[PDB]
UniProtKB/Swiss-Prot annotation:
Source organism phylogeny: Eukaryota, Metazoa, Chordata, Craniata, Vertebrata
Originating organism: Homo sapiens (Human)
Family: Belongs to the nuclear hormone receptor family. NR1 subfamily.
Tissue expression: Isoform 1 is widely expressed in many tissues, including liver and adipose, and highly expressed in skeletal muscle. Isoform 2 is primarily expressed in immature thymocytes.
Shown chain mapped onto the complete sequence: 265 to 494 of 518
Purpose of the protein: Nuclear receptor that binds DNA as a monomer to ROR response elements (RORE) containing a single core motif half-site 5'-AGGTCA-3' preceded by a short A-T-rich sequence. Key regulator of cellular differentiation, immunity, peripheral circadian rhythm as well as lipid, steroid, xenobiotics and glucose metabolism. Considered to have intrinsic transcriptional activity, have some natural ligands like oxysterols that act as agonists (25-hydroxycholesterol) or inverse agonists (7-oxygenated sterols), enhancing or repressing the transcriptional activity, respectively.
Name of the protein in its database record: Nuclear receptor ROR-gamma
Subunit note: Interacts (via AF-2 motif) with the coactivator NCOA2 (via LXXLL motif). Interacts with the corepressor NCOR1. Interacts with CRY1. Interacts (via AF-2 motif) with the coactivators NCOA1 and PPARGC1A (via LXXLL motif). Interacts (via AF-2 motif) with PROX1. Interacts with FOXP3. Interacts with NR0B2.
Amino acid sequence: ASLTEIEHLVQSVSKSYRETCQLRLEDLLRQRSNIFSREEVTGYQRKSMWEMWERCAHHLTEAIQYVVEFAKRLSGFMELSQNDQIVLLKAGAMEVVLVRMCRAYNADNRTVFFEGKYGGMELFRALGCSELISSIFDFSHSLSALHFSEDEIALYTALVLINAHRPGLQEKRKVEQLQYNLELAFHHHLCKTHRQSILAKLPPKGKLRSLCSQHVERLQIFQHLHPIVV
Ligand SMILES: Cc1c(NC(=O)c2cccc(C#N)c2)ccc2c1c(C1CCN(C(=O)C3CCCC3)CC1)cn2C
């Protein structure tokens, strides 16, 4: 593929991300000073695991929507079979939500944006899954260290979604081609921005997949005991 085709793909993913980023980076950064008081923290910690489950499920479904919209705006995604689209989204939408979380994470105080303010992992005490929440905080902490640009997130999360290795892909060669184009797009933009160094610093492919697997397992248990309608 020619260099203008690669650049166009970079511009496209970058534009698709801008339109589906949920909140602008500037807004998240600004609101870092808007932190929960000790009383608000105590408020959340006193809630039952069921009220906390409802609040986290509401936040995660709002997050998944923007990711679904992001995927729909990706070059060649709509062209795939409904089965192949679903295979890609069921496997990768939650992995993208985990990557996008680094933008609303503040490494200075180890806080996250949740329900209009910033709070530490102590906010999620009532859920009773401190190991899982501590692992999600660790993953966001390691990505925050990379100081990802908005276009770097766009390209990386596009590559999380467009994966030819997903079990159950019918049109596997189409997906292999789209993944190949996006990989040239990602390498090209990193060279143009003098950021090829981040490639080494990225999480091992298995890390994201394993953390998402753990997260979803926990959400499935909560769904079985206390279902929530979309
Ligand atoms: C909320 C959040 C953000 N905020 C955002 O991503 C955010 C919020 C509002 C606009 C935008 C935007 N744009 C981003 C960023 C980093 C985060 C989190 C969290 C939560 C996630 C939800 N929770 C769960 O699923 C538990 C896990 C077990 C079952 C329920 C508890 C832990 C952890 N870290 C590291």
